[PDB]
Design a protein around this motif. Sequence first.
Motif, PDB file in Angstrom:
ATOM      1  N   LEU A   1     -17.349  -5.726  41.571  1.00 43.61           N
ATOM      2  CA  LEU A   1     -16.552  -5.976  41.116  1.00 43.61           C
ATOM      3  C   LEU A   1     -15.707  -3.940  39.951  1.00 43.61           C
TER       4      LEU A   1
ATOM      5  N   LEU B   1      -8.884  -8.473  47.439  1.00 42.01           N
ATOM      6  CA  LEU B   1      -9.209  -7.259  47.389  1.00 42.01           C
ATOM      7  C   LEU B   1      -8.978  -6.536  48.634  1.00 42.01           C
TER       8      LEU B   1
ATOM      9  N   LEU C   1     -16.632 -15.184  45.001  1.00 41.90           N
ATOM     10  CA  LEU C   1     -15.947 -13.468  45.156  1.00 41.90           C
ATOM     11  C   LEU C   1     -15.027 -13.758  45.558  1.00 41.90           C
TER      12      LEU C   1
ATOM     13  N   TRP D   1     -15.517  -1.141  41.669  1.00 35.59           N
ATOM     14  CA  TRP D   1     -14.690  -1.059  43.133  1.00 35.59           C
ATOM     15  C   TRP D   1     -13.108  -0.556  42.257  1.00 35.59           C
ATOM     16  N   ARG D   2     -12.887  -1.099  41.200  1.00 34.69           N
ATOM     17  CA  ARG D   2     -11.750  -0.756  40.668  1.00 34.69           C
ATOM     18  C   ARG D   2     -11.919   0.562  39.499  1.00 34.69           C
TER      19      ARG D   2
ATOM     20  N   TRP E   1     -21.349  -9.443  41.807  1.00 38.20           N
ATOM     21  CA  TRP E   1     -19.720  -9.294  42.096  1.00 38.20           C
ATOM     22  C   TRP E   1     -19.116  -8.545  40.982  1.00 38.20           C
ATOM     23  N   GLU E   2     -19.785  -8.682  39.566  1.00 35.58           N
ATOM     24  CA  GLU E   2     -19.209  -8.689  38.348  1.00 35.58           C
ATOM     25  C   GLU E   2     -19.333  -6.936  38.489  1.00 35.58           C
TER      26      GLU E   2
END
Length: 94
Positions: A9, A84, A79, A12-13, A5-6
């Motif tokens: 993410l 989100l 998560l 995503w960011r 997830w890191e």
Amino acid sequence: MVPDWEEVLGLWRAGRYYEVHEVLEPYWLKATGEERRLLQGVILLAAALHQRRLGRPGLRNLRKAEARLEGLPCPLMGLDWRSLLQEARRRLGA
């Protein structure tokens, strides 16, 4: 296997929605139950946001994402998906 997830993410960011999709699809395909719903939901949100960027309708992918995420515990798979979803709604004007 489980997603990092890191890493996701971070994509995503940065708004790299296609890459978020590429990373998660393999996991989604092999997933089952709530984990599958979680993975598909995130994928659908990325798709909705990518479509909005192109100036195209994304509310259909959003509702589908909401149905997949609806009722899931949070966090899940490590998560915080609610954050989100909340961000996606703001960006999509929904």
